[PDB]
Design a binder for this molecule. Sequence first.
Ligand SMILES: C=CC1=C(C)/C(=C/c2[nH]c(Cc3[nH]c(/C=C4\NC(=O)C(C)=C4C=C)c(C)c3CCC(=O)O)c(CCC(=O)O)c2C)NC1=O
Ligand SMILES: *[C@@H]1O[C@H](CO)[C@@H](O[C@@H]2O[C@H](CO)[C@@H](O)[C@H](O)[C@H]2NC(C)=O)[C@H](O)[C@H]1NC(C)=O
Ligand SMILES: *[C@@H]1O[C@H](CO)[C@@H](O[C@@H]2O[C@H](CO)[C@@H](O)[C@H](O)[C@H]2NC(C)=O)[C@H](O)[C@H]1NC(C)=O
Ligand SMILES: *[C@@H]1O[C@H](CO)[C@@H](O[C@@H]2O[C@H](CO)[C@@H](O)[C@H](O)[C@H]2NC(C)=O)[C@H](O)[C@H]1NC(C)=O
Ligand SMILES: *[C@@H]1O[C@H](CO)[C@@H](O)[C@H](O)[C@H]1NC(C)=O
Ligand SMILES: *[C@@H]1O[C@H](CO)[C@@H](O)[C@H](O)[C@H]1NC(C)=O
Ligand SMILES: *[C@@H]1O[C@H](CO)[C@@H](O)[C@H](O)[C@H]1NC(C)=O
Ligand SMILES: *[C@@H]1O[C@H](CO)[C@@H](O)[C@H](O)[C@H]1NC(C)=O
Ligand SMILES: *[C@@H]1O[C@H](CO)[C@@H](O)[C@H](O)[C@H]1NC(C)=O
Ligand SMILES: *[C@@H]1O[C@H](CO)[C@@H](O)[C@H](O)[C@H]1NC(C)=O
Ligand SMILES: *[C@@H]1O[C@H](CO)[C@@H](O)[C@H](O)[C@H]1NC(C)=O
Ligand SMILES: *[C@@H]1O[C@H](CO)[C@@H](O)[C@H](O)[C@H]1NC(C)=O
Lengths: 50, 199, 286
Amino acid sequence: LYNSTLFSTFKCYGVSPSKLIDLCFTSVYADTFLIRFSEVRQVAPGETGV
Amino acid sequence: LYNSTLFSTFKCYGVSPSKLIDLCFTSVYADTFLIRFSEVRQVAPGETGVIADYNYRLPDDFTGCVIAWNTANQDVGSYFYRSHRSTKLKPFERDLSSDENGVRTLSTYDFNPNVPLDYQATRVVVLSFELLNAPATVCGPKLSTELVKNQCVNFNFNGLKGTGVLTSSSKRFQSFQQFGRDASDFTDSVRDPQTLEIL
Amino acid sequence: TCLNFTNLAAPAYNIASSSRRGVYYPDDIFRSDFLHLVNDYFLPFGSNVTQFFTQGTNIDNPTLPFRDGVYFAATEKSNIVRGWIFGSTLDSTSQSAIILNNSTNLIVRVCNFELCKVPLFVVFKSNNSQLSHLFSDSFNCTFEYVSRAFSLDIREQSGNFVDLREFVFRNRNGFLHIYEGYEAISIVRGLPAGFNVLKPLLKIPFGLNVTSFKTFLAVYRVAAGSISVASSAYYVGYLKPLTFMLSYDLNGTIKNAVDCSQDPLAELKCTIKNFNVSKGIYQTSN
Ligand SMILES: C=CC1=C(C)/C(=C/c2[nH]c(Cc3[nH]c(/C=C4\NC(=O)C(C)=C4C=C)c(C)c3CCC(=O)O)c(CCC(=O)O)c2C)NC1=O
Ligand SMILES: *[C@@H]1O[C@H](CO)[C@@H](O[C@@H]2O[C@H](CO)[C@@H](O)[C@H](O)[C@H]2NC(C)=O)[C@H](O)[C@H]1NC(C)=O
Ligand SMILES: *[C@@H]1O[C@H](CO)[C@@H](O[C@@H]2O[C@H](CO)[C@@H](O)[C@H](O)[C@H]2NC(C)=O)[C@H](O)[C@H]1NC(C)=O
Ligand SMILES: *[C@@H]1O[C@H](CO)[C@@H](O[C@@H]2O[C@H](CO)[C@@H](O)[C@H](O)[C@H]2NC(C)=O)[C@H](O)[C@H]1NC(C)=O
Ligand SMILES: *[C@@H]1O[C@H](CO)[C@@H](O)[C@H](O)[C@H]1NC(C)=O
Ligand SMILES: *[C@@H]1O[C@H](CO)[C@@H](O)[C@H](O)[C@H]1NC(C)=O
Ligand SMILES: *[C@@H]1O[C@H](CO)[C@@H](O)[C@H](O)[C@H]1NC(C)=O
Ligand SMILES: *[C@@H]1O[C@H](CO)[C@@H](O)[C@H](O)[C@H]1NC(C)=O
Ligand SMILES: *[C@@H]1O[C@H](CO)[C@@H](O)[C@H](O)[C@H]1NC(C)=O
Ligand SMILES: *[C@@H]1O[C@H](CO)[C@@H](O)[C@H](O)[C@H]1NC(C)=O
Ligand SMILES: *[C@@H]1O[C@H](CO)[C@@H](O)[C@H](O)[C@H]1NC(C)=O
Ligand SMILES: *[C@@H]1O[C@H](CO)[C@@H](O)[C@H](O)[C@H]1NC(C)=O
């Protein structure tokens, strides 16, 4: 995805980035939705907001 | 630069801001390049992405500051970046190979004011410094005051400590060091930074 | 322009053993009467290095690997060994850095060099002893350094090696660290056993992927026109991740060191952190 996508937010919890290459995950799930640009900061553990 | 510039990013590592005024840095280097606005978050120690491993990589024990600001309506040409590589780069390393023999490795982006905010051109300046037992030659705007002795005073020979100051006449220095080192990782008998008199 | 050679002999990878050689300062902090352990990259005590010499119809300048750091030591009289080139694949497809001494200036420059097969300096015995070409071409690049001018003697035959120059090269965070040391000698055969610390000299920012290196030599052209080589030798060793135990004294100089992985006595010395051991039986760490 390096030459086709541009991500403005990439935050990982419980595992550091640049370590996902040499790791195996046993149960992966993906959740998708669509919000406003200012509400991305509310998608985090222990946050508040609408 | 307070009445001329406006920085969107000012993050320092290994030293807090509002302390750079009263500090001296021995070896100072500046790295300059140009990326998109959304890729500024990748210029950090320990990050991932197309910039952090194929174009520019910071060491883990990094000391310095990262400064970025948007420069639309100033940079209009077409610029290039590395999209893929066989391996990832070492810290503070370059790869000037414009193309491989098999396939081209350099992808391009075009910068224009009409392009969206996520794809706009910003300038990034990265500084790096360290502190040794040597003259620094890069200091802040501090004025030397009167030297007093035989009292409990706080001295600022590039480092803060509050003791009593006397005259030393039995010290042998190596003409590089300012303070030296003791057995318990202590610094004693500091030097006047412009003279050779050892306190 | 570069020369032609057909009577060159293949190098013989002779084996000579170092002994307490290749110790450099790890930190720029003045310490006196100190003693502490350091885990870094060092040349192992008692390890064997490879021998290359230029004696007769035998010029030995091959491309050698740059794994984790190189110990370089040269025993010469007539200034045969001049400098080195560092880089990857040593051609025009990538960038390479040189450190050179052309008997007038010290040259530090990294460009897109195109090296020939046998890069040598040529000195005329007659004709007031000028220098000559090194390589073919080098296009655009982004670094320069020319030092001050000096005069260098470029011919002397004493019969015995009188100079010993030792170097340690390291690559870390885009910097090339250089540690230097000099010692007067009088030998005929090989690498003398001894001990001398090396001081930090250079720190050049390159940003280069360094995997190989090659050395620059010098030869002589006789008045008839043929080439004649002069006696010289150099040795190459590699650094390994090891634990050492250095000592400091008055004036803050390193005077002794112990490689903790050599023998059980060195392990015992590193365990109790002392050069002198009394009689008894002691438990040692690994
Ligand atoms: C290109 C790398 C290079 C380095 C880093 C270098 C360092 C270097 N060379 C010398 C002297 C120094 N260097 C040389 C010559 C050489 N020294 C060598 O490492 C080599 C390869 C030659 C040439 C064959 C001489 C003949 C002297 C003595 C100069 C004097 O008598 O003042 C010093 C001490 C200066 C002083 O205290 O007077 C240093 C730091 N020389 C170099 O050429
Ligand atoms: C981004 O990179 C991918 C490969 O990672 C490119 O996809 C290739 O495109 C060529 C033509 O340029 C095709 O022949 C290949 O079959 C493609 N490979 C794969 C694996 O799909 C892609 O073109 C690049 N550019 C963009 C804009 O997406
Ligand atoms: C930002 O501040 C600097 C520093 O005061 C200003 O430079 C001064 O400009 C005036 C005229 O406006 C001159 O008389 C002074 O000599 C200048 N000072 C120096 C130190 O050169 C600068 O004009 C200000 N910029 C803006 C855009 O307001
Ligand atoms: C530094 O350069 C070397 C030499 O080109 C690179 O090693 C090559 O890696 C590729 C990866 O596909 C191999 O195909 C080559 O055979 C390797 N060459 C040798 C001589 O072993 C190395 O990857 C480069 N290092 C970095 C960090 O980019
Ligand atoms: C320069 O240093 C000298 C002592 O070396 C001192 O007397 C003098 O005031 C200094 N000058 C300035 C302009 O700071
Ligand atoms: C090298 O070798 C041959 C034989 O000496 C000579 O004819 C040829 O021109 C030379 N090649 C060069 C100088 O490139
Ligand atoms: C050092 O000598 C030993 C003797 O067993 C040999 O195996 C080894 O290859 C030598 N080291 C090098 C680097 O050639
Ligand atoms: C050494 O190289 C420098 C590079 O500027 C040059 O000026 C000088 O003439 C050279 N000296 C020689 C070839 O003797
Ligand atoms: C002597 O040196 C000059 C100047 O480099 C050169 O032109 C000439 O050919 C040389 N002569 C001999 C006989 O080597
Ligand atoms: C050097 O010049 C060549 C030939 O003109 C060019 O293709 C190349 O991009 C240049 N290298 C740079 C600017 O780094
Ligand atoms: C320390 O330096 C002084 C300088 O005069 C010298 O005389 C002395 O021998 C040195 N100390 C040692 C232990 O070599
Ligand atoms: C300890 O060993 C050193 C050599 O490492 C020797 O010179 C010295 O005499 C020994 N004894 C004492 C008490 O220092």
